[PDB]
Amino acid sequence: SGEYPTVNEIPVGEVRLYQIADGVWSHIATQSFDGAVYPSNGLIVRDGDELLLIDTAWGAKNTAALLAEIEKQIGLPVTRAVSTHFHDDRVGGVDVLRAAGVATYASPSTRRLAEAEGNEIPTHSLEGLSSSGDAVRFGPVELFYPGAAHSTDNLVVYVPSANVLYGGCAVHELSSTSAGNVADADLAEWPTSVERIQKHYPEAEVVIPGHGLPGGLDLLQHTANVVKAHKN
Ligand SMILES: C[C@@H](c1cccc2c(-c3ccc(CS(C)(=O)=O)c(F)c3)c(C(=O)O)[nH]c12)n1cc(CNC(=N)N)nn1
Ligand SMILES: [Zn+2]
Ligand SMILES: [Zn+2]
Numbered sequence: 001s002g003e004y005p006t007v008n009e010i011p012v013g014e015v016r017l018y019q020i021a022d023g024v025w026s027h028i029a030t031q032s033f034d035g036a037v038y039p040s041n042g043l044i045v046r047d048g049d050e051l052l053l054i055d056t057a058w059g060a061k062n063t064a065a066l067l068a069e070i071e072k073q074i075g076l077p078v079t080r081a082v083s084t085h086f087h088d089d090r091v092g093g094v095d096v097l098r099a100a101g102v103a104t105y106a107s108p109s110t111r112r113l114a115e116a117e118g119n120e121i122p123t124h125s126l127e128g129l130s131s132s133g134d135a136v137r138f139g140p141v142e143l144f145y146p147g148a149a150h151s152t153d154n155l156v157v158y159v160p161s162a163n164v165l166y167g168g169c170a171v172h173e174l175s176s177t178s179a180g181n182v183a184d185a186d187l188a189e190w191p192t193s194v195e196r197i198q199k200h201y202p203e204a205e206v207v208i209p210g211h212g213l214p215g216g217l218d219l220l221q222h223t224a225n226v227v228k229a230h231k232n
Contacts, residue, residue: 004028004213007039015057015066017044017073020206020214021162023140025074027066029057031089040089040211043166044070044078045159047139053081053102054141054157054166055210056093063093067100078102082138083122084155084168086113087184089210094120105138107145109153129155133196144200146170147193148186149227150179150210154193158201165204167197172223173212179223179230180211187231191224 003009005016005028015029023046030039042055051074057066070078081097083090083106091114094104106114106122107129114121128136132147142158149170157166165171170193172180179185198220207219 005039007037010039013061013065015062015069017069020208021159021164024159024162024164026208026214027057027069029059029062029066031058031062033088038211041208042066043157043159043164043208044074045140046074046076047079049076050079051076052139052141053078053097055084055090055168056081056097058089059092060096063096066093067096080105080139081122082106082126082141082143082155082157083110083114084157084166084210085151085153086110086117086119087151087169087181088119089169091120091122094122098123107153107155110155113151113153132193133200135200144197146196146200147189149190149193150182151184152186156197158204163203163205164208165197165201165206166208167210167219167223169210170194170197170223171207171209171219172226173209174215174219174222176209176212176222176226179227182230185227187227190227194220194224194227 025044104122105124129145
């Protein structure tokens with residue numbers, strides 16, 4: 001009823017949307033992994049009379065439910081999707097999107113890692129993002145490669161019309177006490193990559209983590225803090 005959705009407010013197998021700003025929503029779904037249940041976020045950005053999707057809803061059935069929830073709540077077609085790294089909370093559901101007519105995109109690094117890991121593979125490669133600090137425009141957003149952090153391929157997304165920074169899994173929520181699933185992370189480089197985000201997007205008003213509650217710019221420093229303590 002208005003608060004940011006958590007696992008306890010999303011019915012089984014469903015997705016909920018949250019209005020972040022004019023023409024910007026997050027999507028929230030839940031999934032089980034190694035015997036525990038986790039929430040995860042993505043983004044939806046209005047692109048005229050179409051929608052740009054950032055990240056799947058973590059699984060085929062969740063992503064089908066996402067498309068149905070978008071049709072119910074927004075009613076504009078999703079035409080393109082970008083996955084911000086290679087893990088299943090970002091690409092799991094790409095096959096569903098592709099069969100629903102959505103053009104799916106990721107960096108070549110993400111596509112290679114997804115392929116090698118056996119995860120679903122976005123169709124189209126996003127060039128121009130291979131060096132840290134690189135940025136490219138993609139419809140109503142800017143895509144930014146901050147350097148290795150949660151994964152070597154992680155991208156962040158900025159919505160300039162609303163000053164919304166979607167950090168993906170390189171950014172953690174304020175309540176977090178550890179650095180999440182770090183199996184593919186670079187804990188030594190992560191603070192430097194966060195510093196790059198801070199320097200590039202100093203006017204961000206909303207910061208959205210890959211998992212958990214949005215907040216403000218404090219999420220970036222908090223993330224650096226929890227990562228440094230995980231490493232040390
Ligand atoms: C599919 C994905 C995955 C599954 C389950 C949990 C998470 C979390 C996470 C875990 C805990 C918290 C709470 S908290 C910050 O308070 O600890 C959180 F907010 C997020 C993250 C993330 O952190 O983005 N991602 C996860 N995955 C798969 C792999 C590869 N694994 C490997 N052995 N090679 N890595 N991630
Ligand atoms: Zn991940
Ligand atoms: Zn994640």
